[PDB]
Design a protein around this ligand. Structure first.
Ligand SMILES: CCN1C(=O)c2cccc3c(S(=O)(=O)NC4CCCCCC4)ccc1c23
Length: 130
């Protein structure tokens, strides 16, 4: 190529083999209710898989975004009991939304989509059990 096209990292890790299986009510609720609701939102699809910098023509994406995150990764982390607590899961959602804000211009369509998803997410985490 005569113009830079970018390249993609391996996707984020989704399992911690050394970590003990510690199931919790909040993590179960995050997987079964919060993530499922977010996944089905009309604006979710761009956030469901890792950014393909090459296919999306975002050649500098991984120059700018040092800690990629997407909902498919979060889903797998929940499934694999990767998180010790709800706060770690919530931090990954936050990384995903803030990545979008970092990379893109405040007025961009993708940013509107992220903001709508983030607003729903923040509502849903008020539901977490004790
Ligand atoms: C959430 C990951 N992500 C981006 O940060 C981003 C920037 C620009 C386009 C784009 C796309 S895209 O599929 O190339 N463009 C979508 C942009 C949002 C408007 C409606 C759907 C098209 C998907 C995921 C993205 C981006």
């Amino acid at each position: 190529h005569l113009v830079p096209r970018g390249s993609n990292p391996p996707p984020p890790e989704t399992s911690n083999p050394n970590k003990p299986k510690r199931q919790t009510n909040q993590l179960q609720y995050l997987l079964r209710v919060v993530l499922k609701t977010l996944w089905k939102h009309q604006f979710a699809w761009p956030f469901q898989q890792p950014v393909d910098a090459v296919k999306l023509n975002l050649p500098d994406y991984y120059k700018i975004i040092k800690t990629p995150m997407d909902m498919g990764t979060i889903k797998k982390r929940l499934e694999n009991n990767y998180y010790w607590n709800a706060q770690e899961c919530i931090q990954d959602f936050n990384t995903m939304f803030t990545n979008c804000y970092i990379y893109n211009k405040p007025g961009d369509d993708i940013v509107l989509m992220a903001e709508a998803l983030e607003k729903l997410f923040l509502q849903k985490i008020n539901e977490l059990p004790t």
